[PDB]
Amino acid sequence: EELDTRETSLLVAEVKGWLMKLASGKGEISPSAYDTAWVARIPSESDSSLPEFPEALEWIINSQLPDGSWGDDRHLQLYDRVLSTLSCLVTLKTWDIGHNSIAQGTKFLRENMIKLKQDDGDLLSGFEVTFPMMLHEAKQLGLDIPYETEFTRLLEISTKKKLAKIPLDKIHSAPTTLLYSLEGLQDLEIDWQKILKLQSKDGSFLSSPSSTACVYLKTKGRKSLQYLQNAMEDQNYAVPCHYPIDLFESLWVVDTIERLGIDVFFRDEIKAVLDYVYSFWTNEGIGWGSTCLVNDIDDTAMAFRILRMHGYNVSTDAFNQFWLPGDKFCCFVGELSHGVSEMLNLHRASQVDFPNEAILTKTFKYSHDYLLNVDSAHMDKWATKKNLMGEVAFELANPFHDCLPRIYNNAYIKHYGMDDLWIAKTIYRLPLVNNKVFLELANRYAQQCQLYQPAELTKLVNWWHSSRFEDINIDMLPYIYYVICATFHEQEFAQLRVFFSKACCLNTLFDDLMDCATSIEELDRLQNVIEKWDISLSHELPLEYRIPFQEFYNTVLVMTEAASKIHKNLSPEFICKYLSGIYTKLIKSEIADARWKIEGYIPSFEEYMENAEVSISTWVHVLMSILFCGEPLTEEILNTIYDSRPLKLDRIICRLCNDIQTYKIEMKLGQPTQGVSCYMKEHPGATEEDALVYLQSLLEKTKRELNESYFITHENDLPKNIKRFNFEMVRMMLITYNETRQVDLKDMIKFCLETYRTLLEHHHHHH
């Protein structure tokens, strides 16, 4: 299971170094033998008998594999090995060097060319034109290889039929995918001088060194040669399939770190990388690199989501260019089709939407429908990624707002391929995206997240027993602790996790009793004691409420002691009044709903929501837990946070979601739900499905307002951890009522049971 034996501090320092390099546009991509050899054809400008890149020629000689091929060493794929080997042999032969390398390479091709077949690996980009061209070039140089098999003959025929259907003016009219593989069109009557207008900012052709080298040899364009000279020097005279991909690489690295849950180590360095990315973001999105020709929706959606989530101002106008009639989207404008990766990232991006961003509703519906209809049996069938379809499955089953951090992180830890490879002109690797260090760190942090759970659950099970809740059920505890662990996972939140679990347990107990209330006068008895918050009146309560209220009262004292030790600027009296204040207001609103139901009273919808927004309870755990979320506090914050816009949005979102799901259940029962009912009495024309549709629409509109208030830092905003808690409280509510998710933690329920049993068995083992 252990992948690296170094201290965590050494792994963290290593990754911080990688990130700071990416924040300057410097990354790591495997060299391409095919591209290095292509570019190494170029003769010196002043002496055409001398190569411009003799260091590249030495690299080719020194990087040949022991079987005589070139290409990706760890994953043998015949398209990759054959195409790469042909390029190196052509270039070695062109310069009349590397005789032993040529002998060893031609031998490989004599033994392996007959093994080439259809459907034997991923289609390399442009393969249908790069492979026949390269084979003809080797044939023209007299290399001792098989010049035709059934496979190559059928391929060439298929390619030439495809080529005849393309007007050659289209290849210089507008950017097409063929600009990445111009070396395959070497012999067509292309207008090479007009092709020069489709070059990128740096002189390249879709960032491909070989494609660019071909245009250079056709046109002698200066900027194209300089692109190559500088690429060669930057990459130590072995170039990749495309360069630079400084935006794609840095965003995929940051994404990987966040999906794995190890961003906790790298806050400042991630900020450095996102500042670099943001310096290239435009209102038309981005492409894969800072010099690239065209924008694409994969890079644009990745940048859009991560930048917005980190508080940067990005416009959804960046997606307009990808719109197609019928509210479909393309990855590249003019494309014939697209793939899964970009739809997965488009789907993720669409869910951090703000109000009045209707394009993100269209992108969500398009990507979600695409993802639902993929062919799972055949997707990434060569396993370039460890589990791409598992990522798609997880994303379809877990809405952004219904997902908690560690739930996401622990699922992605199982999907993450430390040895993934990538497909372009040939096979390549991104060692900063896929490596053992990320996974080792992710497993260590996962383990750190578990280390505190035994003691915390043991405190909670002991509190359950000593509170005598068994004398008026404990299975509610593991689920509550599960979700607070998933959202506030850093070990510094120990008191928050425990005080949150205690508070949720208490209110669950109180509300389950209040919803059983035989009749109203016991409620009015309860309300009076709560209003005075006077423990000396607990004898006046119906005895089933004495146990919970006494513990509610006690836990407030304990909470007050703990919070006053943290907040020296706050008096214990102030904190105690604050806490008993919010729990009074909460229990009062829950009584009101119990009273209404026994009365049969149905208020207007505005009147119902005035109380049901309070009785939904989530806000009371926000206002308590902010005492323990690590932020400095003031009396003004405590006095004004209940009415702040984020807390209002919280109460609205959680009530709507509760009532929408409660109606589905009460449907199968005879009973009418009070949300739909109150809506229908207010709007005497509405079906129950109207009420639902209205609630669902209000829910989705309010979630967009929550995103805008949370991800963007506003003037006089709440402190960061308070906004975080409010946002995660909403997500903890939504996942609890997502009944797809609940249907399908075991660790925690058994631990709690065994621990409880030892308190009741006390000190004697039973058989």
Q: How far is CA 354 from CA 329, 330, 349, 364, in A?
A: 20, 22, 11, 13
515 labelled binding-site residue: yes
Which spans in 167-245 are helix H? 170-173, 192-195, 209-219, 222-234
Q: Which residues contact 542 (CB under 8 A, 6 or more apart)?
A: 522, 525, 526
Q: Whole-angstrom Cα distance, residue 691 to residue 682?
A: 10
162 labeled part of a ligand binding site: yes
Q: Is 511 annotated as a binding residue?
A: yes
* Cα torsion 100, 102, 103, 104: sign: positive
Hey, which residues does 329 pair with through a beta bridge? 323
To the question of whether residue 658 is assigned a binding role by annotation, the answer is yes
Residues 512, 517, 520: CA angle, nearest 5 degrees: 140
How far is 51 from 44, CA to CA, in rounded Å? Answer: 5
- The reply to whether 169 sits in an annotated binding site is no
**Which one is the CATH code of 11-235: 3.40.50.300, 3.30.70.580, 1.50.10.160, 2.40.420.20?**
1.50.10.160
Alpha-carbon separation of residue 57 from 60, 91, 418, 429 (angstroms): 5, 8, 31, 22
Q: Confirm or deny that 299 is annotated as ligand binding.
A: no
- Which tokens sit at 349? 């991006």
Task: Look at residue 428 and give its three-state secondary structure.
Answer: strand
Q: Would you say 473 is a known binding-site residue?
A: no
Q: Which residues of 690-725 are buried (b: 16+ CB within 10 A; e: fewer)?
A: ebbebbeebbeebbbbbbbbbbeeeeeebeebbbbb
Note whether 577 and 556 are within 8 A (CB): no
Beta strands in 594-647 (DSSP E): none
Sequence ranges of the domains in the chain: 11-235, 444-761
Closest CA to 555 of 616, 505, 512: 505
Q: How far apart are CA 191 and CA 212, in angstroms?
A: 15
* Strand 427-428 with 328-329, pairing: unpaired
298 is in an annotated binding site: yes
CA contacts within 13 A on the Cβ side of 65: 17
- CA 164 vs. chain centroid, Å, equals 43
Query: What kind of experiment solved this structure?
Result: X-ray
Return the structure tokens found at 373: 């209809």
d(CA 11, CA 16): 9
- Residues 653 and 710 sit within 8 Å (Cβ to Cβ): no
Q: What's the reported resolution, in angstroms, to a tenth?
A: 2.0
Domains 11-235 and 444-761 share a fold: no
Is the CB of residue 216 less than 8 Å from the CB of residue 38? no
- Whether residue 35 is annotated as binding a ligand: the answer is no
CA distance 439 to 429: 17
Q: State which fold the 444-761 domain adopts.
A: Farnesyl Diphosphate Synthase (1.10.600)
H helix or E strand, kind and range, residue 621? helix 618-625
What is the distance in angstroms between the CA of the first residue and the CA of the last residue of the chain? Answer: 37
